[PDB]
């Protein structure tokens, strides 16, 4: 069941935009209460069926996650045009966040990678792939509690594989095996949660500035890694350069990951 284009009421401001159209803010009626959500509103009122198709492939992911630390969608609604409706995080992304916001302490950032690593860790029970971790794809709901979303180019792995085979291609997140041998896995999310780690510290700096992603790929295979962000606790930064085993058979999957985040934040 689809949702009532009725029920909907959009601002006129556009939160964001980019191919496929535009993100608007809006509020949706409930069965009392009224939410706040952002609407992935599709271009040229849905003209291109590649488009439309990744809307809904997108949509059919979201149905089958429940996390506190995974965007949550409200539903679809076919209307003027397609509509995908989340609930709304109020702050946006992290990056852009902590450009802004430089103040923030280590022990924010933490708490807020510590909750990252808590969705990846059910995600990789949930036998998906995000594919597309990165700073810029997580949300803050408050200053304390950060969602991950774009589930655009996530993939529900098969009941008998533990990997996925393959135009966007983030290279600068991508573990050696993605780019090598086109295999995703949630090991490989585990490298890209690394980096995501390096921009959370970085204060949402661009990793890898300067380089084309064949320098990267040169630069990683040559045993060389980013460098430990200013301020960032020595624990924090070894934790990263485990995220960046080469070797997928011996990198740690998100339990180990999260339960490191979890007792350096908590003792
Ligand atoms: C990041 C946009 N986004 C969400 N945006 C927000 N809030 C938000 C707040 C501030 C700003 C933005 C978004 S922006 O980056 O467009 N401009 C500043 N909350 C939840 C979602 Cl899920 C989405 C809404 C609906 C479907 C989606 N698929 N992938 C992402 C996404």
Known sequence: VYLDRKL???????????????VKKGYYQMKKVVKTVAVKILKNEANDPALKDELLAE??????????????????????????????????????????????????????????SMGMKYLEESNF???????????????????????????????????????????????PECINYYKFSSKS??????????????????????????????MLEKGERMGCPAGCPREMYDLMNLCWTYDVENRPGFAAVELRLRNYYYD
Not at 80 to 91: G, H, I, K, T
Not at 155 to 163: G, V
């Open 8 to 22: 909907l009421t959009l601002e006129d401001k556009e939160l964001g935009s980019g191919n496929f159209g535009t």
């Open 59 to 116: 949509a059919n992911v979201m149905q089958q996650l429940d996390n506190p630390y995974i965007v949550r969608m409200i539903g679809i609604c076919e209307a003027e045009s397609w509509m995908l409706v989340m609930e709304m995080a109020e702050l946006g992304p992290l990056n852009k966040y902590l450009q802004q916001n430089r103040h923030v302490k280590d022990k924010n950032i933490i708490e807020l990678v510590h909750q990252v």
């Open 129 to 175: 792939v995000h594919r597309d971790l990165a700073a810029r794809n997580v949300l803050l709901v408050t200053q304390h509690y950060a969602k991950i979303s774009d589930f655009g180019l996530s993939k529900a792995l098969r009941a008998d594989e533990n990997y996925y085979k393959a135009g966007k291609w983030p290279v600068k997140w991508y573990a």
């Open 189 to 218: 999310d585990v490298w890209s949660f690394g980096v995501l780690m390096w921009e959370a510290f970085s204060y949402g700096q661009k990793p890898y500035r300067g380089m084309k992603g064949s320098e990267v790929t040169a």
